[PDB]
Paper text:
Each protomer comprises the chymotrypsin and 3C-like peptidase domains I and II (residues 10–99 and 100–182, respectively), with the active site consisting of a Cys145-His41 catalytic dyad located in the cleft between the two antiparallel-β-barrel domains.
Crystal structures of 11 [name] mutants provided structural insight into their altered functionality. We employed crystallographic structural analysis together with a high fidelity FRET activity assay by our group to assess the functional and structural changes in [name] mutants. The crystal structures of several variants revealed the changes in side chains orientations of residues in the active site comprising substrate binding pockets, especially S2 and S4, which might lead to altered amino acids preferences. Accordingly, changes in KM values for most of variants were observed, indicating alterations in a mode of substrate binding. Also, we observed that the charge distribution in the active site changes quite dramatically even upon a single substitution especially around the S3′ and S2 binding pockets.
Numbering used by the authors:
A (entry chain A), B (entry chain A): 1 to 306
The structure:
């Protein structure tokens, strides 16, 4: 038993983390096959980031202006191109540790593991979720740009995130591995703010099902509610509107534990209107929304992926 | 910026995770050089665990009764021995992925990363702390035995934990890599209970310093307190007695932020006597005690270890 925030084994990703140097700037890159992917603002200095013409700045750069280091080994750059907000440095040697991988644009609410890196060296890994406002609440200091988010299914590494910037509000924004920013953020140093960050309701119900499996049952009420009435309460407390697809996704969690989805929605409705009354659930005094229904089934059933 | 629960990159440990089979039982083992370390209750069935004579059960076993699998490769066992609560299976081939490692018996309050495994396959990694009652609050299902805890400094893998059992209370107990159980627990299926689990006070103050660095300052009071008076309040709310060594360890956190340790102890005293009043600190409504003062300096300064 037990339930904690888990990340995928980051071994397959460490073998792809490189250091990219371009002028006075250095950040991390992702080395898959003979292409190194890195944020495109490595070609900017601190003064260019106010309003950089990336196409113009990229013209002044040649292949030999990109210093890619894989540990102690240096990869000779033989081609550079940019799509959206990412660079593609074609290198001469392919990564011998390239795992089976995909580039996946995840949807909001879904989670992934983040391998934080500095100077191409992995520094730690933590679990994060794609907030409804397309931000993530990771932890990134200077030099962490280029760190990737990913999910590990079977043996395939599903890359989904690349960190790009810290917003003035303290949260983080980035792109998929094709360079497309999640949300309406751009890779500039301007007044950027994220919208209303609501709560992923389907994740909260999955986290509540994991509580029942683990022994916490004080919240299981003696009431019920319909999907329409529950969504009325959800909008008052800034929760994502629950759809029937969410109810269908919570099917196995409902079948494993015996509490119907709408029955758990009433328990969540009671928690939104009465609070926790000083109690805790899975060691937390708040309602957690960064566990997808798959994340719970992973941990409450023991799925491996080596 | 940002602050989250972080684990060390588990890559160096995945290359050491093997599967050990002995009869109908299968759990995980740690393969360093030409020795595989695994829990000693792999030689027991479900009925032996009430009161197993491990020396007697180990006599009935020979080298060829131990089936060690490293992925698809099988390691031929050429020698078996047990020290305390761990087995040592001498194998013919040394692990080509053995990192620089140590066997370290950590002290309570210190943290480590746990790589959960099933059938020798890594399944996920989460950060945990050695509670004052020598338990850990991980997450372990059947087949997770043999999973290790570790810390990564520089390039050296400091192994410190090996999971052994789920207590009836739902928490977990284990040994160091020399087989010595943390705490008064034994590797049997008997009525075992952990003592009073108190709060690691020095960790809470470090987590409060990380809050100040990250922008949370609502708890920084206009009072102060002495070490004696604070320890009086700490014992009322079941907190570890703060020593001068703890104050000395919080030195750099005090110097980086400007709030003295005793000044922060008054803010913590106010939080113990008044609660959070509905507010949160670093996204938590409770007081976190699973961040060592080193864990904060790791994350608030960007220390890498590849």
């Amino acid at each position: 038993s037990g339930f904690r925030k888990m990340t995928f084994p980051s071994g397959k990703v460490e073998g792809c983390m490189v250091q990219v140097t371009c002028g006075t700037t250095t950040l991390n890159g992702l080395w898959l096959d003979d292409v190194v992917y890195c944020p495109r603002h490595v070609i900017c200095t601190s003064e260019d980031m106010l309003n950089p013409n990336y196409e113009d700045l990229l013209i002044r750069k040649s292949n030999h202006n990109f210093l890619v280091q894989a540990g102690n080994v240096q990869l000779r750059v033989i081609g550079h191109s940019m799509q959206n907000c990412v660079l593609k440095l074609k290198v001469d040697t392919a990564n011998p540790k390239t795992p089976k991988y995909k580039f996946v644009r995840i949807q909001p609410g879904q989670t992934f593991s983040v391998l934080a890196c500095y100077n191409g060296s992995p520094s730690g890994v933590y679990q994060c979720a794609m907030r409804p406002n397309f931000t993530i609440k990771g932890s990134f200091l200077n030099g962490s740009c280029g760190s990737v988010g990913f999910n590990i299914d079977y043996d395939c590494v599903s890359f989904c995130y690349m960190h790009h910037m810290e917003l003035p509000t303290g949260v983080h924004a980035g792109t998929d591995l094709e360079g497309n920013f999640y949300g309406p953020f751009v890779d500039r140093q301007t007044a950027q703010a994220a919208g209303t960050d609501t709560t992923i309701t389907v994740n909260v119900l999955a986290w509540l099902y994991a509580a029942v499996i683990n022994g916490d049952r004080w919240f299981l009420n003696r009431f019920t509610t319909t999907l329409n009435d529950f969504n009325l309460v959800a909008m008052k407390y800034n929760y994502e509107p629950l759809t029937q697809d969410h109810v269908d996704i919570l099917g196995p969690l409902s079948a494993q534990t015996g509490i119907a989805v709408l029955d758990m929605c009433a328990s969540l409705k009671e928690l939104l209107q009465n609070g926790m009354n000083g109690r805790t659930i899975l060691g937390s005094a708040l309602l957690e929304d960064e566990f997808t229904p798959f994340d719970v089934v992973r941990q409450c059933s023991g799925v491996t992926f080596q």
